[PDB]
Design a protein around this ligand. Structure first.
Ligand SMILES: CCCCCCCCCCCCO[C@@H]1O[C@H](CO)[C@@H](O[C@H]2O[C@H](CO)[C@@H](O)[C@H](O)[C@H]2O)[C@H](O)[C@H]1O
Ligand SMILES: CCCCCCCCCCCCO[C@@H]1O[C@H](CO)[C@@H](O[C@H]2O[C@H](CO)[C@@H](O)[C@H](O)[C@H]2O)[C@H](O)[C@H]1O
Lengths: 78, 80
C-alpha cells in the first residue's frame, strides 16, 4: 500500500534529518548556554533572525525541531 | 555578532537544506497517494502509524510535520 510505503520513506527521511543536523543542534546549544530564565528570549530572537531571510516549511520545521531540543536541553539541566 | 543571530542564520541554512533535499520527494509522494479532501486525514494517520512503527526521534516528527503541511496545501490547492 502506498500509505505504508510513504510512511517508511518518511521514516528514512526523518532519520536522515536526525543524523545530518543533531550534532549541529548540539553545538548551537553549547554556544548559546540557555537557561530556563533566558530560553524564551533566546528562542524568539533566534526565530526572528531565522525568518529575516524568508520562510518555507523547511525553516519552520527546523525551528520547531531546534526548539524542542532547546527545551529538552534546559529541562535535563536547569 | 549576537550568538542568537548566528544560530538563527544557521537554522536558516538547515531549513533551506531540508526544503531542498525533501520537497520534491514530498511532491512525488503526494502524486502517488492522490489525496483528496475526504481521505487526507485518514491517509495522514495511516502514514504516521507506518512511520512510527520503526521508532521516534525529532527528525521523524519534523519530517511528518512538513509532510502534513504539504499534504494539506496540496489537497487545498487541488480542490480550488
Ligand atoms: C479536520 C480533520 C477531521 C476530519 C473528520 O473526518 C475524519 O474521517 C472520518 C469521517 O470522514 C472520521 O471517522 C469517525 O467516524 C467514523 C468512525 C471513526 C471516527 O473516527 C475521522 O475520525 C475523522
Ligand atoms: C508544534 C508541534 C510540535 C513541534 C515539536 C517538534 C517535534 C517534537 C519532537 C518529539 C520527539 C520525541 O522523540 C524523542 O526524540 C528524541 C530526540 O530525537 C530521542 O532522544 C534521543 O536524542 C536526544 C537528543 O538530545 C538525546 O539527548 C537522548 O538521550 C536520546 O534518547 C528520543 O529517543 C525520542 O523519544
Amino acid at each position: 500500500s502506498t500509505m505504508g510505503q510513504v510512511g517508511r520513506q518518511l521514516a528514512i527521511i526523518g532519520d536522515d534529518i536526525n543524523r545530518r543536523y543533531d550534532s549541529e543542534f548540539q553545538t548551537m546549544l553549547q554556544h548559546l548556554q540557555p537557561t530556563a530564565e533566558n530560553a524564551y528570549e533566546y528562542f524568539t530572537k533566534i526565530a526572528t533572525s531565522l525568518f529575516e531571510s524568508g520562510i518555507n516549511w523547511g525553516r519552520v520545521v527546523a525551528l520547531l525541531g531546534f526548539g524542542y531540543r532547546l527545551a529538552l536541553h534546559v529541562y535535563q539541566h536547569g
